[model samples]
Target chain A: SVFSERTEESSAVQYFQFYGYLSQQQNMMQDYVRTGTYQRAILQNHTDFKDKIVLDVGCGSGILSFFAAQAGARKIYAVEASTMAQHAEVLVKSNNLTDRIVVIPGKVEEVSLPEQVDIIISEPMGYMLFNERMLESYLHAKKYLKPSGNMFPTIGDVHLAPFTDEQLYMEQFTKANFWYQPSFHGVDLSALRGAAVDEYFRQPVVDTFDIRILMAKSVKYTVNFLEAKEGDLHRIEIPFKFHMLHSGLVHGLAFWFDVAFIGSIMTVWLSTAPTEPLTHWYQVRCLFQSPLFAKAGDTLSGTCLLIANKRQSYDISIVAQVDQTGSKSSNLLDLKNPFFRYT
Target chain B: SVFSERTEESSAVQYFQFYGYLSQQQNMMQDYVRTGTYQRAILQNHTDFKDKIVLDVGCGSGILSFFAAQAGARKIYAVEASTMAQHAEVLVKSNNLTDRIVVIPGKVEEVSLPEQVDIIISEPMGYMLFNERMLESYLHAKKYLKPSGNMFPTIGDVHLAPFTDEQLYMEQFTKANFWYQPSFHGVDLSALRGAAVDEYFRQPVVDTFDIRILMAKSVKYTVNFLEAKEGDLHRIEIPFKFHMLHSGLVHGLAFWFDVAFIGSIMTVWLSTAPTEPLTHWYQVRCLFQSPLFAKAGDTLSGTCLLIANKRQSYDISIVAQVDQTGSKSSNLLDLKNPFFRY
Candidate 1:
């Protein structure tokens, strides 16, 4: 028990250290879509927040608590497990909202609260919406909310679409052939080229993409925050059938997540789709080993699974095959047991 | 003594691991100026290599050895200290040059060489020319070369110049102000902003530059490899007086290195200057804490020092003061005892 406690404490320290980085903090603050949406959603719903007690879970910088204060909340509890909580306390005093906003400098799961609140607000979505497993902590914090209490992000969806990336295909080959240079500076590693290509091609690439690269429209899998249970975050399987928009090379599948804040006044939707202006949560490209060529009027059907792994990240297993324009589909799109991890 | 020996062994392993990265190999290979210059220098001077023996120091992939083989060299010793040495051996075998070329895997200082050679060729220049202290290894490897023999790159020079970078100054401020935001997303770090700015501003930045930012022409400090001794690379002091070309804000100093390969037939100069085509070496910018305003004809005189640090890197210390218009030389350029480590 002592060893396990020490391990947990160390992991907790690392988590705080990561959030304390100024560059990462800047990354989140500059994300206008993320911050502005939260601001508008909170301020606009004056009826819900005016004179009401609010709880902000996982409040790294206490930005949401400040917004809740501005929205006329009678009391706000900002609970954070990071070292940034000290800076947040300074911010609360500097902003002259100390009387209303109480800064709690410990984990919401283990920390004791004085009383339950009317609403729980948090921005806990990580890369691909579940990479860091922050949602588990958010669910644990839900105990502080009253039975009739509401949440900021009511629902969210992870969108999946197939794309054709000419440059991306070339880039992976460049990284692969890096190991495959036959006469490369007098080294012969051509025998290891295919294996090298296989390694890089199988890893998921997180990058920004233009909508013009889409081979077909996307399909989305939704998650409702209020109804979700602890075990629900363990696994998610999405069955999708993407009809080709035009003739091009199908590189692999692309993903982006959009969450909605259904407020008292109106619902605010924050989309990190390629079509939308960029956000800190760019997009993920789950690439295949080789490109599958498909023509217009072709169908690509597949099953994509996201399983929570030991590292607190996701291991994505994508099994897909192209059902082309001709007769019954062959294994042209058969991705042979492709396993990828998100870091 | 055993602990110190183990420490050296660990550092040696880390050094080899760094060079073995495929991306780094790709970076060196794709630098046309770096590889092609060596190729041309060897092939063009056929008389020196014809039936001669060559020793290639720090031969990661045996590329230069193969070039020597193409130049009609009778024997070539390819020495490397990385895992890539294994791959170079396979390459030698597959290229059917095992008859003439021999691959030895070990440190240049500790490894034994069977025979002295007519020529020693190596590309050992690192960032700012003196970083990584590889020139020390190249010097040790020189013992294997005949006294009358010549090296591929006979001489090299490190160039220093003052520049006005509108974007670089603005970018640093942006990174600094990232810590200064008074109410940054609910956190207040404004009080510690100046200390944060000082930390980043003092550190040197390594990047490529557009030559249009030049405030004045440069000064060149030469190093003749044939005439250089062991202690020469330990410290280099370049006294420069840069006269401004126009009215602009002088940010800091910039540096790049160029080496010349003087062959029996022709001399080829490879420049990693910002004005020239891009290379992996790019250039280095030794930045200041604050930008100094200078009018036309303003003279910024200074002494720039490159001393080898305990780490295989250089600690650059610059002492400079700008002599601006209407002055009995006031301390307008008083940089104070601003001791910055590069």
Candidate 2:
């Protein structure tokens, strides 16, 4: 008897269709930091791509294909899992690079190439570098790469830091505090505030923030794409200890990533850090349930996890323990919620 | 032969569940104008509700139930079609009005009443006057009303006007212009601008705006609840001819509604108009695909349809044929894609 190889799964239609959308493409294209880094890295090392066959994974809108063609690639197989491949074909023909670039419209795992390639290039970084589980596709496409070939975006590092923003926390607390009143416009809304507070705390806030709110220097979890295994990215934990520079309430934690394009001749990187110029994927903040008090020289040690989930997204779980500088006792420190919404 | 009697229809579970959300309740309660007018109209004419049996339809959070109780109503049957009826019951019991106000957690069509009521009270208005199709439910609850009974907020009017705003239209057109680039950063995106422009213009924008954008005085279509029949609300076409006060591009049309609470002894009204104070329901503007240019004293006339649909929402179809102020010819006029999302 024959059955399907797998049934306990979801389709990548949600993932591909989203990447296919022009709005999403526009944001990534307009991300000058991201697009410029790749352009510079490729052009700066045109010697490495000269007369070489290349494979471009997740080649959205064929921007990278055109870049490789400009870099004098002899032939390129551009693998795209979304309908943006159609637009890429249109763009390639219009740009007169159709002879050099062949747009393959299918997932890399399913699309068998006619020949192996000498180089692999892709934009595999998600929100926190590994947020969308796209790196696994790159790993699957590894079979089509020549043994001596190198990968673009050779390095990625996830960054984490504790932050204390009284204003941001107070604003959310006030909204959750909305239902705490017993007689709001002549009705008891007391039973509703707890749910509000819980919901507000559970979901991570995807926003850009002022770098001044960071309590201390950050910590990093490096993912060398060339050296990473398929199982290595599913579960990751990096510990961080931030010593307070000034007395303030510890409201939450923040996460972002930096990516490096290490070519044979040059190394270029783009930072989505608060200190760097902004990108489409901004920093994510996980607001803690209970804000803790800390004085100068207080230490806040925490563990951050990038736990992969079924939706091609990851959960950023944070747990913290604080040591006060001989101040008042702490009430609570529970921050166990937040997920990246890849859909 | 037996049949299950008229099955080509839909259910209201989606409608009721939306009202059950606490988020929706807070906005309407926080709407001071909407809440205050009902308060003033009720308390000001306490004599009208005194010693009378009142029926409160769709009494979410029991706000109207409490208002009637304060006005000294002898008894009230608060009917709600959602789980919000449970919260309303809790509030009534906590306020010690459980003995006077009985919360009926069921739709008006299904709920049976013990006796005919002398008064019917409800906030039966939606986005426009007849949005959400909730007025039909209000009319269904009319079965429990006595012959001499009166309805609160017995009047409603849907307002319409033409507006001119070059900045807003140009902003949207500029976004649509994003796709017209043949070589934007080394890629041709000229193929995607039409869909972008069409999408940008299709959806109605719910926002507040300065009254200066209006071309002329507005016209209103009144819905006297006591006089309007069910068939009359299904399809309504109101015509308007606006004489422009200034020269500008006629970008779109704007719409809002005003409600009144006319009691036996006093009258109060709340306007969600641009000229009046704001409410939770803001004005909706439908930008045209081709913005027509009109000069001062130019006469622009059109027909607006408050056409009802199955999803309890209404399509606001507006068609304009303008007589410009003896100037350049019009490019196009196709203003058909707009809806009142209840």
Candidate 3:
């Protein structure tokens, strides 16, 4: 029981560790503003907020609350779970908008607003779109809105495609197996090399890659904020099929997302797709146990399962079948289990 | 009770998170071997290990075990609690040293070795010497060591000194306040800057710094592995006094440690001091709430308390009193209790 207790404790600390870092917060704000779609969508439809109540879930420093206040909202409720709420309170006071904006220092589930809101705005995306699982909070906040109310980001999609990058794969493997170098200053460390390679493939790699490496794109899943149920956030499987555009080796799958701001007057989409400028959630690379080699016109099809684990992290299982002429080959890559440990 | 249970679970995950990173392990081995002192010391004392048993505590990657086997040790027990232990086993088999070395995959407190060891070897030092709290493991392994055995790093000392780095302090402050820049493409983000600065001051900065910044070196505490009790690591308070060597502003204190391998035939010291070559365990920079200005003849005295926190992390508290021509001023910087939530 104590062991399990410790595990839960450590997971909570790890979860908050990211939010505790100022640099992480800066990255999110910098990316959001630079993306420019969120602000443009809100300001362009300023009439929607004129004398209307607005709720900003996971307000985070009250940036969204300020935006709503500036757009002529009747009143704004900013809900934040982290200590950043203290700073938000100070900022609201300093800006002399304390009366228009209220900072609630708790989860949206426990905090109450004066009345139902007309709009709910939140930026709840993380690595691979669901790593933080904050979308569940957004869904919960949806019930507090009026029937005619709208969610700022009305739709979200998770996309994936087969990719290959020899340089990155080799670099990760080399660093992991550096100790296994035949001889390290005249000592034999080659024994640890196998374990090193195994360790590298255990978790998803977070890095930016050139868009040219991908073969074809597939929308793994999509969420419509208005109609999606909480159960929809659980385990789900999606099938993907791709035809190689160029002859090359397929090392892994690259994943990203796109969120749309649908307003009463217009709509704008913010994408983390490689085609757009890089964001803090740089594409996630799911490495395969072995490289997949295919020629132009070859087909690579697979089913990927996105399961939410006990720790609030996702365990991704990908199975791919490749057809070359009459012969076929298939392999399964399960991130939940690794064959070797370097400890 | 469930809330506390969740907290404990998160703490455990946070602990393992460090060991899960391959980059962190790679950095340790590369830095250890590159330093060129630990290996030479153990090799020079090869006679002491020949045909003798050795215990490698926290034997990550089994590098130290391999070193002992190479030195003709009769037997070696490599104990590790991380997944890396699985790799160590594979490595031992591939190197044909399976007969000489045994990899034990569990905490030293729960695992049993075949017999007492002649020498205990480990690289357990962390940032400022106690951040990771591995010293507790080393001390626990001592009971399994022979009365005449030697700990690879026989002596460990924690050192601290007043330091001032205007450039670094300002750089951290600027990065934290970057969002507050008047207009970022015409979007006002000044609200988040205060939270940024608050977060920066909550944790100690791990970075290499110039030795010239130190006002005076003070040995806060020392541990003799052979006789150190687990209680020695509780709450420790050490007094410190420094006379400004040059007219400058004092912003914070810098901390590091010196670990020495003193054996029968040789001695080697791995120092994380600023004067020494930079190591992975870079000097820790503990910032102050407010900077103190001092003249060449001015003096600053203070007492620092190092308390072990519930999560195995250290809570550092420093109280300083500065005397400038008999006009004294005092201030306390408690990292454990950062006043503002942000």
Per-residue error (Å), model 1, residue B149: 9.6
lDDT per residue, candidate 1, B1-342, as tens digits? Answer: 211232244344446776764445655767888998888888889888999998888888678888899899999988988876776787688778898789989777767889999988889898777777778777767778898888878888999888888677777777778768776555465754664466456556677877878888898889888878656777778888888887787788888999998888999888899988877777877776677778878888878877765445566777666775522211111121122222
lDDT of 2 by residue, B1-342 (tens): 000111112325435766876656766887888888888888887987898899999999788888899899999999998888887887787778877899998877778889999888898877656667778677666778888678787888888888888877787687678778887756677766775576567667667889999987788888777766655766778888888888778887888888777787877887889898877777877788777787788788878876766556666667776765443222221222233332
Better of 1 and 2 by DockQ: 2
As for model 3, its CA RMSD to the true structure in angstroms is 5.1
Please list the C-alpha lDDT of all candidates, in the order they appear. Answer: 0.74, 0.74, 0.73
Write out the backbone clash pairs for model 1.
none
lDDT value, candidate 1, whole model: 0.74
For model 2, how does the per-residue alpha-carbon lDDT over A1-343 read when each residue is reduced to its tens digit? 0001211123244457568766567768878888888888888889868999999999987888778888899999998978888878877787778789999998787776899888888988776667667787776576887888778878888887778888777766687777788776565667666655665566676778888888877778888877776667777777777777767787877789988878878888888999988787888777777776766687877677667665566666677767554322111212222333322
Clashing pairs in 2: none
DockQ of 2: 0.16
Better of 1 and 3 by DockQ: 3
In model 3, the number of clashes is 24
TM-score, per-candidate, Cα-based: 0.69, 0.74, 0.86
Error of 2 at B118 (Å): 8.2
